[PDB]
Nucleic acid binder design. Structure first.
Lengths: 150, 52
RNA sequence: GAGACCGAUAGCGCACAAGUAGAGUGAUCGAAAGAUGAAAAGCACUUUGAAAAGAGGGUUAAAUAGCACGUGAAAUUGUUGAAAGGGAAGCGCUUGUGACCAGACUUGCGCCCGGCGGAUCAUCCGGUGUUCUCACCGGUGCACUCCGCCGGGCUCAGGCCAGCAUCGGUUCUGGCGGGGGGAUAAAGGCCCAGGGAAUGUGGCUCCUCCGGGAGUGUUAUAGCCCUGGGUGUAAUACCCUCGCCGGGACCGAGGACCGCGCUCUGCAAGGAUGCUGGCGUAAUGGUCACCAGCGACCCGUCUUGAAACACGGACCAAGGAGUCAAGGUUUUGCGCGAGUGUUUGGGUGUAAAACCCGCACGCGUAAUGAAAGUGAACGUAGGUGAGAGCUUCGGCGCAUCAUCGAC
RNA sequence: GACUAAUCGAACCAUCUAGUAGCUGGUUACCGCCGAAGUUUCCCUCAGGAUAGCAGUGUCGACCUUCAGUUUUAUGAGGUAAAGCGAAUGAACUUUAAAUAUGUAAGAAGCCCUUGUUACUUAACUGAACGUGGGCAUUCGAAUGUAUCGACACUAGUGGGCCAUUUUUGGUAAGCAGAACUGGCGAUGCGGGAUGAACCGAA
RNA sequence: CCCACCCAUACCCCGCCCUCAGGGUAGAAACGAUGCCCUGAGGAGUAGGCGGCCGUGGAGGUCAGUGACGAAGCCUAGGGC
């Protein structure tokens, strides 16, 4: 016998989505290829967020995007791996290029009416395969009723 | 696919140590000591050795 | 009129002359029990029995369906066959015996000749289709070209068990040749020079049983001890170490090449090949029964720390115990998203489905206070330290955390 | 306390009713991955509770920062042996100094210097705290090890049991009774002690 | 005190199973990518927790599925996984 006071630890993170969405499976295959064959850390972070559950992908609003588009970020491509929602408190939407997992109808309409562009993540993979000149944004994780109750 | 002992397999020994053939050829494990008449043990050493 | 219900221990207590039979004075209690066959064709006739029945012979598609009746399990029993058994059997590992079995194999592929039988040989032309350069179809072959068949010959690959040779991995065991160390072993032999004694050799003296004793003293007609020196860097033991040659066991994972290398025409170098024999079947292998060697408490429960006590278990079949609803909560998937939720209802319908519709309403979008009430931006929605990621390489800084402010 | 249809300290029948039990019994295929626990701390006890600790599944965060039942070094506790007193003085003597385990500390997240304030404190702008600025990256300032991170969420058993070594406190005619650490067992097979909860080897 | 010898699931070497870990795999001659290839470590378990599989009655779809030339059931010192 061998004395092993320490214990080998199995992985405590997701390695695959629990979702059965076929298009998400295709996206996961594409970003597995990109994070294996490139050196860009952007692709690895994107792959990990594609694995995540919905409470780990809180929505990002247009006012949050407009806040982060200030101070030299007006030309960077915004990348969100969750839903982008509309904020009707934001009366003037700036021009922006946003790639998201999905958009709400009003958010897509307001971005296109302001003159920006909405992209899917596979179009993002085509145009920026190394994540150059991008702004990777997350929504508020702890802004949940249960997390308040913790 | 298979670990081979270089102490048994001479080819593995030559792979890991090219000087092994020169060692065996020149017999560096059988080097004689330098010549010269050895001085005898001094008497005080033997007296201390056999002192009760 | 129906069902993602039950299928004769189920489903109503009742699929049947069931609220019957039966019990209780009475109020009341309350079962068991479905299936021959398509058709009775439900066995004529003979025979043996008092009879029940039996045997022949019949019916039938089947009596291996005979009103004990579809199928016909187990407990348990009879006969037949095999076996074991000196105060339990049963079980595990491993042989053997006997009985009984499943595979595998029977030849294939490729060449070289000879003989047949045919032209769906190559090229070219026309049409058609396609992946747009590849094909198919019709004409052209005139048999040194193609395609099958039949005889030989040859190579290779083929089933089971084994033997030998050359290797690789691991390992046990025997012998041989060297090197080094120590007080450059210590001893020891042979010499040289000193010194000494006794368990005193020879000699000499005295006693005797004539066998041997006692005394004296230092090598003589034996020898020994101590010291120094030479041979001598002597030998050997012990310890350490560099190699070489045999004897034996178990194992052969991988599957084009690639690499590290070497003793470089090649190899023992990133894992076994070569040669040969018998057999080709119960021979190997497997199953069952039994004997033999070794191993082996009766399960479940309970208790405490544990055993023990105690409790349940004659045997078999079928039945037999964390379910459903409402409401929370956390997590997963999905739709939409500052909104969200059609299904109370209405419209519609191929009619309990599916499809469509919207007012109200619920929850969320604002909090706080007992209440009256009041009600969230100084600032690119603030400062500072971190922070993934991006960067024009100056910085910008997500989530989140810490800390100081503001409402 | 006899008898009232084999029924009497309160008959029989049906129903409420599938009454309640904390007590007893039972609770239905397989393989794989992990895997425990017995005063820690608080509460009036027994007919007591929580709770720490120890576990498993999910995630998430830069799985960033390193940490560690260990030694060494400086320094405490144990000065206790020891050596000397041709050193002084006399376990209580000391120049020096035990074994055993043991506490604290050992960096850039650190060390100082300076500036001021103080509502602390000090005779006191004096210390200290609070901030401010600066200097120190020339070696990042012992060894060994390091698939050992952190934070949430949800779920579960056990949370005043037995034996033993050592240490310690009390005792008995003799037995023994409390604590503390550690190991084992309850949950565990194997080899040996002929045999077996507590023995030896080894998981 | 000395020499040899005996054997544990312990230790060493080799094969095989599983689990965990770390790598490779698309201008695809390209794959049950939920796959395959390479390498290393590890393997007892009550309460307890988690995963994957097997089996039974019934429902939708599908297999142009099986079946009186014999479905289901039952028996079997007969076999295979």
């Amino acid at each position: 016998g061998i004395d092993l006071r320490w214990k080998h630890v199995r992985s405590s993170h997701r390695k695959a989505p629990k979702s059965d969405n076929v298009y998400l499976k295709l996206l996961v295959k594409l970003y597995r290829f990109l994070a294996r064959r490139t050196e860009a850390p952007f692709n690895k972070v994107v792959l990990r967020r594609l694995f995540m559950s919905r409470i780990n992908r809180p929505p990002v609003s247009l006012s949050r995007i407009a806040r982060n588009l200030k101070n030299g970020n007006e030309k960077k491509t915004v990348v969100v791996v969750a839903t982008v929602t509309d904020d009707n408190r934001l009366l003037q939407v700036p021009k922006m290029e946003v790639a998201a997992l999905r958009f709400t109808a009003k958010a897509r309409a307001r971005i296109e009416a302001a003159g920006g562009r909405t992209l899917t993540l596979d179009q993002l993979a085509l145009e920026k395969p190394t994540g150059a000149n991008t702004l990777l944004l997350r929504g508020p994780k702890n802004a949940r009723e249960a997390v308040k109750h913790f | 696919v298979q670990k081979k002992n270089p102490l048994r397999n001479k080819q593995i020994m030559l792979r890991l140590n090219p000087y092994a053939s020169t060692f065996a050829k020149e017999k560096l494990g059988e080097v004689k000591a330098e010549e010269g008449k050895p001085p005898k043990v001094p008497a005080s050493f033997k007296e201390l050795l056999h002192e009760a």
